[PDB]
Amino acid sequence: MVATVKRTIRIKTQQHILPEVPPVENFPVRQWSIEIVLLDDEGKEIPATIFDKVIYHLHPTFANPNRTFTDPPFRIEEQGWGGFPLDISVFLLEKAGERKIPHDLNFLQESYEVEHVIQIPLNKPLLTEELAKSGST
């Protein structure tokens, strides 16, 4: 008896300094991006079509702090000087549920990936169908 399956998502972050932007209290301003992909059962990256939207919830001092994206890989691009942490809401197809995933934005590496396992229900036929792309159900 099984009502859910687990899938691993991979959050991919890059960042680099923008030298044309004045540092803020000696901290350089960086352009940074986050994208999300789904891993299949062999660990290959595929589009994360199990989400029909992703909202990045940024530090409230950002101009546009809750940014909604609807297409894989849900790429957000922003600029800042401090590595303020953020929360990533991913919404499963067919109103199957929000999963709210914190993320640390850090400037020690040029790019880094972080994986998360999420548990997904098997009770919305379209999602259940979509889940077949990334592993067994």
Curated annotation (Swiss-Prot):
Residues carrying the site annotation Acylated histone binding: 104
Keyword Ubl conjugation: yes
Ubl conjugation listed as a keyword: yes
Region (Acylated histone binding): 59-61, 81-83
Highest taxon in the source lineage: Eukaryota
Role according to the record: Functions as a component of the DNA-binding general transcription factor complex TFIID, the RNA polymerase II associated general transcription factor complex TFIIF, and the chromatin-remodeling complex SWI/SNF. Binding of TFIID to a promoter (with or without TATA element) is the initial step in preinitiation complex (PIC) formation.
Protein name per its UniProtKB record: Transcription initiation factor TFIID subunit 14
Species name: Saccharomyces cerevisiae (strain ATCC 204508 / S288c) (Baker's yeast)
